[PDB]
């Protein structure tokens, strides 16, 4: 619903910041210049005013001590718990890499592969129809 | 407004030197933005490929044609299976969003982080009181009604 995980990985020397909504799959992704704390915090605040964030999982906790990450969690009232998407991500990135002139791009083409592929079998629907789908029922919900 | 839920608005504004790109789901008044060093085509087709990535664009609307010109937002645009849209809340959003940065600029170092601060400021606003909805929760509700 409102849980996402973040973590960063990296390819030709670059960093790419890699978001997902672990209910639906929804991906989202950046390559930033390096992994800082400024452009976590930074991510985090898009992220925030775009989904209902309020959880946020991590596979390296220590991205998210730095006093701006904190501030940012706490003026957006993003939580964390301390304590496939990605290696498909890369694959994916592999089969676009010639398609486009920066990695920058390729990532953004990888994103939009991932969030509109359809699920031939059961629930057919994608990651992007997913997440949509999911926060418009909670919000009916609670209406 | 009106309609369509794969139509889209998007422009530029300047402040503090930098660029301010925003794009504006026109049913919804949903907001998304990006600081850029300047306006250019790579600017331009970067961000319509990451919004195209998220939400089901259709088509794009802009005020100034020549933003779309570029080949490489052609090349975008053709990728994406995105195409021009061709003819008051959007002239609101804009300016209110420049409200919103100013009033919570000095609580930020960056102006990219202030930008962020009021689009999700904008985004979660609820208006229509009483069984109102913010900007956020009528795309999100739009997009999931059309299938």
Redesign the interface.
Known sequence: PGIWQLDCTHLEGKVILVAVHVASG?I?AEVIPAETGQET??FL??L?????VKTVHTDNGSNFTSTTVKAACW??GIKQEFGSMNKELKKIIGQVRD?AEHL??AV??A??IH??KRKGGIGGYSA?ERI??I???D?QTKE
């Not at 925030?48 to 209902?52: I, L, S, T, V």
């Open positions: 929804y989202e915090a930074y605040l898009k925030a005013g775009r989904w209902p003026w957006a398609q920058k791009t953004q083409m994103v939009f969030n509109k992007g949509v789908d926060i418009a029922t919000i």
